[PDB]
Amino acid sequence: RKIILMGLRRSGKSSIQKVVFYKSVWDFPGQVDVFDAAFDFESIFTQVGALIFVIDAQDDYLDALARLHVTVARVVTINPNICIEVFIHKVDGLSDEFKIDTQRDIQQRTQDELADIGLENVPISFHLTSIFDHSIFEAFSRVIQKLIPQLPTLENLLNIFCSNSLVEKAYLFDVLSKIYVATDSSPVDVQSYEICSDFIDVILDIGSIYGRSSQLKPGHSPEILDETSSVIRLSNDLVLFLREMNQYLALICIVRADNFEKSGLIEYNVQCLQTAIQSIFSPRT
Amino acid sequence: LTEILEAMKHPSTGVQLLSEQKGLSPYCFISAEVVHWLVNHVEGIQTQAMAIDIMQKMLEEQLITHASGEAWRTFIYGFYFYKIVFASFQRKWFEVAFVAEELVHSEIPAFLLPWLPSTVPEQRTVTLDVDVNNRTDRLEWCSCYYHGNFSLNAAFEIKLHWMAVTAAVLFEMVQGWHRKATSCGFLLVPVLEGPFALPSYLYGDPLRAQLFIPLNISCLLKEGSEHLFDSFEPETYWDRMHLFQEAIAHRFGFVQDKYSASAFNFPAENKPQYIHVTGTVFLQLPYERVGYNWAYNTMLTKTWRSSATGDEKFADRLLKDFTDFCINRDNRLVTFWTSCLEKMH
Ligand SMILES: Nc1nc2c(ncn2[C@@H]2O[C@H](COP(=O)(O)OP(=O)(O)O)[C@@H](O)[C@H]2O)c(=O)[nH]1
């Protein structure tokens, strides 16, 4: 399945793919929409499960809302299993009072015209994104969580792992895109998410500097390498640690240093969660 | 007759009869939709007048009746509830008649014609259940005063009077009305109620006064005349001038605002009012110093603004262009007026 980033001109889609994708995501342009027959829209929209519409908060959005409503009607008449999300963008220059009023105005303007159309069965989500923050990564993570059909199993696994091991917060990141596949039931703090995102940057950059011998051997590694595991202790009685789960996944957990004295039991539960994740994501019958 | 109602009661194509909404009888329908159906799928009538005659024949034979049981009325074209076989029904449901206004068949304008052309109430009242989402535990209600008639070249007025209403729930209901009006192709905006009233009046403001835009009708006069319509009879002449002035108001997008006078008789002391399509500008024709009375709609704020209302500087540009047109800048008005003479073939 693919992810289609819709919207209008000067909405911020190219900057989103510059930040997230450039460090299946497709960017349709702000013009030549579904009324035009320049592309086979019904063939693409059948294979696409996530539709994202980017709405500028500062600019006028009523024509954007009408284009969004006719695009929602088009994709519902194509397939009933598509997920629709609304990306309210360019909120870096806005104040704290402006964002809540803009979100309330956009949600009240959209969810009543959804009832006016009559397609009340489909769920439409709303996200506050900005390319200068990490909220675009969290919004794309919540988009990606809808497409994965294995989200409640991983979420229940992370819930019982956080309850058993006294782990405050857990994420299942993808290290290439800094997008977390699953997290626990506790809310995601932005101060936790920034240091969890930069933890991957420190690990990947130091492993790119010093992981030169073997590592990227063209034929095959003669010895199987260890998984990348890291531990950082901070001064505010908190410990961050990573364990490499798969070839593209990792598990960053936030644990108090009072509870990190029994780090062997947390390591054993991380190994059991590694076995669970590698058995879930393996090909089966 | 009977087979027409049997064709109307078809479940497959039929007419869209109303559902089991609370307060409404079964087999209820809107009169406008079934008049539109009796235009198309019928035994051979075309215009609306004989469709109204057929529905009046069905009303006289008690095949259909009003949803209130008021079996004394004629068939009224518009949003009127009728069912297939008192005044408390009039205080619950909105019922707006439709004016079948004749189109301008004569290419000569109405201020240049050789001969001038020359039931339901004007205002209707319903009682509104303001709280519909049950946000408040108490009972809230307001009285709504609306126009009994609808015309496509006239503005439709809604007046709300309230005491026992929490104004947040009323603002939510008006915002839902504004969203529905934007989706339906209309524009529902708040307007001033007394925009040309004196400061001593009830609806007037002490710091508000109207601006005057003079209309230069001296340049439109011929060589040796003092009346613009001296070729016709003089007794209708000012009325012709009124129509001519209305024609210029129809060029700049002003719609006639038939305001209901609050118990005011003596119809020479109330003047016709015009409202722009954006709802930004009021316009009044006075009467002797032929021109326009210009007022701003200060009730139109940012939250009601859209693409159909323009920007915040639309009214200043409209004032500048209207002042330029009324003063005969670049011989624009003569370019209008002689073009009207080009309709006098
Ligand atoms: N300062 C700032 N600028 C932004 C933000 N989001 C988008 N922009 C700017 O808005 C422009 C939007 O372009 P875009 O719609 O993505 O181009 P398109 O994809 O080809 O239609 C970009 O060139 C950005 O420079 C933001 O959050 N902050």
Confirm or reject: Cβ of A94 under 6 Å from ligand 1. no
Q: Are B236 and B227 in contact (CB under 8 A)?
A: no
What is the distance between the alpha carbons of residues B318 and A212, in angstroms, rounded to a whole number?
A: 72
What is the distance between the alpha carbons of residues A164 and A167, in angstroms, rounded to a whole number?
A: 8
Q: Are B298 and B190 in contact (CB under 8 A)?
A: no
Using the atom order of ligand 1, give the atom closest to the CA of residue A54: 15
Report the phi/psi class of residue A237: left, alpha or beta, with left for phi > 0 and alpha for psi in -120 to 50: left
What is the distance between the alpha carbons of residues B17 and B34, in angstroms, rounded to a whole number?
A: 9
Structure tokens at B339: 């073009």
CATH topology of domain A2-147: Rossmann fold (3.40.50)
- CATH number of A150-281, picked from 3.40.50.10420, 3.30.450.190, 3.10.450.50, 3.30.70.20: 3.30.450.190
Q: Are B101 and B151 in contact (CB under 8 A)?
A: yes
Please tell me what resolution, in angstroms, this structure has: 3.1
Residues of chain A with CATH 3.40.50.300: 2-147
What is the distance between the alpha carbons of residues A209 and B330, in angstroms, rounded to a whole number?
A: 76
Residues of chain A with CATH 3.30.450.190: 150-281
Residue B54's SS3 state is: helix
Residue B207's SS3 state is: coil
Method of determination used here: cryo-EM
Using the atom order of ligand 1, give the atom closest to the CA of residue A132: 27
For residue A75, give every residue at least 6 positions away whose Cβ sits within 8 Å of its Cβ, in sequence order, or none: A45, A51, A82, A84
Using the atom order of ligand 1, give the atom closest to the CA of residue A130: 27
Burial class (CB in 10 A: 0-12, 13-18, 19+), A165: buried
DSSP A98-148: HHHHHHHHHHHHHHHHHHHHT--SS-EEEEE--TTSSHHHHHHHHHHHHH-
Confirm or reject: Cβ of A133 under 6 Å from ligand 1. no
Interface test with A, best of B178, B179, B302 (most A CBs within 10 A): B179
> What is the least distance, in Å, from the CA of A124 to any CA of chain B?
19
> What is the least distance, in Å, from the CA of A281 to any CA of chain B?
46
- Strand-pair partners of B161: B143
Q: Are B258 and B147 in contact (CB under 8 A)?
A: yes
At residue A53, what are phi and psi to the nearest 5 degrees? -110, 125
Structure tokens at A26: 């497709």
Confirm or reject: Cβ of A14 under 6 Å from ligand 1. yes
Q: State which residue of chain A sits closest to B172, comparing Cα positions.
A: A108
DSSP B117-130: -----SEEEEEEE-
- Strand-pair partners of A249: A174
CB contact under 8 A, B179 and A116: yes
> What is the least distance, in Å, from the CA of B12 to any CA of chain A?
21
- Give, rounded to a whole angstrom, the gap between the first and last alpha carbons of chain B: 48
Breaks (C-N over 2.5 A) in chain A follow: 23
At residue B184, what are phi and psi to the nearest 5 degrees? -85, 0
Q: State which residue of chain B sits closest to A115, comparing Cα positions.
A: B180
Residue A172's SS3 state is: strand
